[PDB]
Design a binder for this molecule. Sequence first.
Ligand SMILES: O=P(O)(O)OC[C@H]1O[C@@](CO)(OP(=O)(O)O)[C@@H](O)[C@@H]1O
Ligand SMILES: O=P(O)(O)OC[C@H]1O[C@@](CO)(OP(=O)(O)O)[C@@H](O)[C@@H]1O
Ligand SMILES: O=P(O)(O)OC[C@H]1O[C@@](CO)(OP(=O)(O)O)[C@@H](O)[C@@H]1O
Ligand SMILES: O=P(O)(O)OC[C@H]1O[C@](O)(CO)[C@@H](O)[C@@H]1O
Ligand SMILES: O=P(O)(O)OC[C@H]1O[C@](O)(CO)[C@@H](O)[C@@H]1O
Lengths: 109, 763, 750
Amino acid sequence: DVVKQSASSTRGRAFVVDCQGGNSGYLATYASLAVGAQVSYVPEEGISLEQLSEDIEYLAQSFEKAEGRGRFGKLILKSTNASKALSATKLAEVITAEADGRFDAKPAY
Amino acid sequence: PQKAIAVMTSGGDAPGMNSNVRAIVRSAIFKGCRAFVVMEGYEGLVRGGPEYIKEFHWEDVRGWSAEGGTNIGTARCMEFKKREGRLLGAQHLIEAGVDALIVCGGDGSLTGADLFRSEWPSLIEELLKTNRISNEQYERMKHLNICGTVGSIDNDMSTTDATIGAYSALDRICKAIDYVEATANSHSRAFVVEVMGRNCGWLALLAGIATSADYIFIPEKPATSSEWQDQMCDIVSKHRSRGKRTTIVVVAEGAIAADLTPISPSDVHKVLVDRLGLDTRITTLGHVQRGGTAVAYDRILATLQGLEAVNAVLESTPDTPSPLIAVNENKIVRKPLMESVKLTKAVAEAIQAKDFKRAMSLRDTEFIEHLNNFMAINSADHNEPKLPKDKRLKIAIVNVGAPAGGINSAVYSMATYCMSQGHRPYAIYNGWSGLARHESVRSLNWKDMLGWQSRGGSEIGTNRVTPEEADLGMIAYYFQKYEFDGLIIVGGFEAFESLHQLERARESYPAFRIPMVLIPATLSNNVPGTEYSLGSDTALNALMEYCDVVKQSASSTRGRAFVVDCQGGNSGYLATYASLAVGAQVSYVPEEGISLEQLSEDIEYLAQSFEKAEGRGRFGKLILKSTNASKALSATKLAEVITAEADGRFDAKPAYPGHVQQGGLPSPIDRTRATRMAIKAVGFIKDNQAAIAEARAAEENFNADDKTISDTAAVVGVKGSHVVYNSIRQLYDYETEVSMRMPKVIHWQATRLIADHLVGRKR
Amino acid sequence: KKKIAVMTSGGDSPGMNAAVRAVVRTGIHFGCDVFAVYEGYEGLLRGGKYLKKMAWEDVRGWLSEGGTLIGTARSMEFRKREGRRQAAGNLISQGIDALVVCGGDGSLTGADLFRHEWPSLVDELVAEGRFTKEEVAPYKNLSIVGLVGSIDNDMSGTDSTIGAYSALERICEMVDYIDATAKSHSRAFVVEVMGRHCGWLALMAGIATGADYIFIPERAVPHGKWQDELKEVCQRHRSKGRRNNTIIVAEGALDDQLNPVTANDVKDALIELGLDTKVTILGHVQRGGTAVAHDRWLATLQGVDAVKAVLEFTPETPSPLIGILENKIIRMPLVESVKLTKSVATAIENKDFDKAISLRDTEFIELYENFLSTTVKDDGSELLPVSDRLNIGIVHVGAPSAALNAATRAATLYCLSHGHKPYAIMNGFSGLIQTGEVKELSWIDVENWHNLGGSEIGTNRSVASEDLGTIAYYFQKNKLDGLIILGGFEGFRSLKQLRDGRTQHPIFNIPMCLIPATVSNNVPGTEYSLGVDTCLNALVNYTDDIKQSASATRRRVFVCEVQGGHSGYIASFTGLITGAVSVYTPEKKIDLASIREDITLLKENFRHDKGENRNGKLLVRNEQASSVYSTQLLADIISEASKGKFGVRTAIPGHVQQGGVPSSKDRVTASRFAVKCIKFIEQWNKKNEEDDSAAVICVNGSHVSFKPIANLWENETNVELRKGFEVHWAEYNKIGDILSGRLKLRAEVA
Ligand SMILES: O=P(O)(O)OC[C@H]1O[C@@](CO)(OP(=O)(O)O)[C@@H](O)[C@@H]1O
Ligand SMILES: O=P(O)(O)OC[C@H]1O[C@@](CO)(OP(=O)(O)O)[C@@H](O)[C@@H]1O
Ligand SMILES: O=P(O)(O)OC[C@H]1O[C@@](CO)(OP(=O)(O)O)[C@@H](O)[C@@H]1O
Ligand SMILES: O=P(O)(O)OC[C@H]1O[C@](O)(CO)[C@@H](O)[C@@H]1O
Ligand SMILES: O=P(O)(O)OC[C@H]1O[C@](O)(CO)[C@@H](O)[C@@H]1O
């Protein structure tokens, strides 16, 4: 809640939040449902580059449609074991790049 | 009252003399003596004072371990033959305060040293009785202490297994033949490669084995006159007619027939053309065999011998016979100069008196073994001769773990050896996963393996899947199906684990009730039961060369060090020897780790080094770091920390040679040693049929855990050119630290120290 | 339907396999069918079996294979029309009407006599049973394309023959070994090198090994006086401190009277002077070994053009021979070149060497001139200018390259030749500023620098602007008349800086030129910085080994990160002579889209494999390709998609790309360029008793010239990506994208 409020303040920003739970997506899932996370990645599913690309486009449009409005910050909860290759940090970097100026992303641990 | 030691290289130069000189200079300065270098051999002694008998300082041999020939030169001695020459020599030494002389070179040069030593008293006397030397001097050094270090590419000094330079020459030879082979294969030609070695055939033999030559002409086995033309023509013909497009005949420069008359390359050329009528060319490598930078083995050998050579002259006394450093069963030792040269003069005699077996015995600890091995693999299946009467089994070979230089040689050698015995060799492609999932058994046909003796990579394929992971059942099944009397596993620690699994899977699956044996192989040298896994020397050279190149870089920028990430898992073997071979300043290993304290001092020591070095031209510094030496600090991060801690005084960059560490084409050592391990493994298979056989009856309570049955599942190891055998059970249960994929006791912590001393590093 | 046949006849040379592999795949790509012809003409004669339809994978790995994998035998039977007609039947039998021959000048000739004689032989077959007029119909005319595969580079018409540089490299390797031992015994070695009747090999090797003297036919030595000239030279060098002498003698060496000059003739002469002398005949080591980067590159491109030329054939077009002229690939009338080369002997028979020498490659005369002025004219004799002799300074600006010393050396010797004083500005600009250290170089100081990589005087990236004044202070203090900057972009940036500083600093008005030096080839205005070839080869040897490591473990991809800063030239070139299935450069976008098309090509490609043994695949990614997608992220993203189907590993050669020893090409170019610069300084110095005096020596498609640093510093990407604006390789790439197997894999996925 606190992190999303941040994101909503800057406008056009999403946070990739590193979540616990080892190989269990239980925590990320319910947390996600409870805060209305836009995206959530879990160990059981992984993060396929394809899924990542669509999520980035969808997110992209979200902010466009949102214009500069006040409570449109977005959250991407990511269980750490959801990917050994992409960390919450690297994920934000990739998204921000793929975003291409449209919106950016920061990591949260 | 600081004494002094001096070195000189005499006779034909040989790769590694510089490494020798470098160690002697440093070891002397380390021990507290003053180091002296004699230019242009003994001539240098006739001429005198500085310029020819120049005092050296630590930084003067900097970088030498990576340079060819002798930087201090070697000349033909004229003046020293005469007494006035030998007299001047003594004066000049005395005038330089040098009464300890170390000479590196051929035996001829060694003896000259001894004589000089004995003639010393006589000389100083005349010198006194005529001034030239003060009375103060006469007393001060009325005795000459010397020590020899034999450097030669011929490897023909009887009391030592390897002369400094020998393996380097062998490397040069195999490199030229590998080139010649490719054009030869284009035209399906035949080449007669004339090789050096003077009167020894060590080079021609090893080369032939390494390059899979069709025939070698060595002087220790003249066996012929009329025999060789038929002997050669026969096996060549069989080879060519069965597929081999090329014909490589290695000819020792000093080969002769049984009648002691010489056999020349031409002689062999003619026959190849006239009798067999094939396109033939003669190639005389000449001195390239003398050039090049010393191979890791030579650098490391010369570096150790040099150190010992100083120890020897420093403890020699008027009554001690003149020493000489050598190697026996990969162990640095002292030998009496005289006996040694006497034993060598012997060979010439034995040869001059047709007693060839005698001469052959005077060579190195494993000369004969190689010859027999060559013979076998060379004939292999081309001659029904199937040495054993139907006692021939069906043996399987497989690769498990990372690829490594020499594994293909092992396979090729094991296959062709089987063929000379009558055994039927079967290869299991792509290890256990390849067996269970694709029934990958194949029959190794001689024609299909052309070239394998010297190929890198893994022709039959390898992975890290263990038997249990591929389903033991399917394994045992196919095993039974093909009826394997014995298994030969070539590979690393996964291959170790495999052996172990298959053996303790004995009772439960009687198909494993056969003899097994593991030929260790991994550039890491982390497999228990041996001091040398296959692929090691190839990686050591790969890394060494990389480092040479990288340090050159660092020296170019001035005030710069490189942190090179090394391989070897939890084994600091590679980093250690590499480090010793390239004179790395610092080296971090897994067994020791990288304590922030040590790091700090190394950074300061490094710091001063560069300050004292000023802007000079060859002061680059290397820090070899096994990856596992620290999970926290990577070569990259290490560089960053040093660079920061450096604080502008000097900086550091990372270097990740990575996989080139596996090398390309396996080294002559790795190749020849592979066929040696391969053959003794086949031997183990046959020699262990008895036991588990007369018991491999019904899978009844006649199968247990008795040393006699377990001991048919062992690792062919080596303890200094030796060859040992140890039950996988012995090793796995008491000598292994399986949790970390490596032996419980490390056998090279001592040399780590030597290394520090040579480069001046502390704790 | 078009079937094409490739044959490799004559003496084999490194690169032929590379050549064949192109022809096969370029053909298959364009819908043709390609057939290999084993044992050369012989196999062509023997027909069937000795003639085989090649698959795409039949040539995988051929980029790193010695000699020719389809062999080369000599055939007597072909010498008779029966045999020729014989063969012609074999081809027509397979529906083949295009022959691509790669080999010595000989084979190339015979390949024409065949095309000009085919219809005729076709009739016979129509008659004497064999073929109906109907069958032999479409296969009426022969298409013939020649590729010169030879280490002699004796084919007048084309600047370089496939395998010539490889053999050169081999010579250098061997001579380098010899040096060690020769140095120890202060001896003299007479080294004999192949070359048939061409001294290109000797001449190159001469310059590349710091030889004391050479012997080439194109310059028959003074029939009776050469043994003294030689002794003179060697003696003089030895007195100056040289310990060993090295004389390179070509096989075809001869004197005025066409009397052959022998290695031993040479040896005897030296023995006479009293020097411990040995003779070494390298022999066939000059024919083996894999192809160096130049030959793999040359062979792959020329092979691709041969197929295209075939598809472009017409009844009246004459037999084309694929060559290279302004470092661009060209086609030329085969018959012409065979004659022009045939004529070389002619002029030698009539002792008209001048005529002969002009028939050799574009740069031959230049080289020879370079060699003399750098080695024999140190007599005081040749250009020892009056007293308008100069103080020339030399600095290394940038990361180490492998030709700096060799170049500094050439420049020093030349300078001394003319009586100029060559100064070494120790440790780049930062060094000068901090210490004002400028040592005068002596003949013996520069000894053996010809093959010494790194920078003996020190080199670093500090630029001139760090304290433009103190620099100027020392240039003056040292009375410099000219400046040579050896280095990369920092050097280029520095030259600009100094040009500007002229207004405020009179001393910077002395002539100043930059010899680009960097593994990256990122210096604007030139197509070749020194050290580039050395890098490319280091990368070949590097990839060759890890390529073999992937093949060993089966089903495995390596992501290899190459240097070059923000210039993918090295990346592109490497990818081509590597067969890389994917080359990520900064010039080419790296988005998820691309990565996926890459995972695709891979997975797909891997579905096949089976052949294993030699099946390892790799990606070539440039150092700065993508700030986000690092070599590691790329490798892991890829693994994760593989889903255990295959494995991935990363390769970061790193600083070894700087080399250990310069390659023969870099060693020779360094000498050329170094001298050209001393000359340029001389010219301007005399032309002053205007920025054009501050230039960069450039090479553009074979043509070397000087380019004013100012007009150039607007072809740059200055305070940004530091690289030259344009890119001259986008052709390599699209071709590479075919042979690599990329598009082929792209297709299957759809
Ligand atoms: O301090 P450590 O041992 O790293 O534990 C951190 C976290 O690991 C976890 C997983 O996030 O353990 P576990 O998987 O067993 O549930 C949490 O329980 C715990 O908060
Ligand atoms: O590419 P993988 O198969 O992971 O292996 C890389 C390296 O790991 C090593 C150790 O560095 O394996 P190993 O410990 O079994 O010797 C090397 O042999 C091998 O080159
Ligand atoms: O030694 P550092 O200064 O880190 O340079 C590393 C590499 O970067 C490069 C580019 O890859 O610099 P540069 O662009 O100036 O040529 C290489 O030349 C150099 O080897
Ligand atoms: O180089 P030289 O003086 O001809 O001596 C060559 C001899 O030296 C050796 O290298 C032994 O030192 C032999 O292999 C060779 O036959
Ligand atoms: O190998 P061969 O049959 O002796 O032919 C050698 C000749 O071939 C060449 O390599 C030319 O193809 C020459 O350099 C050499 O003189």
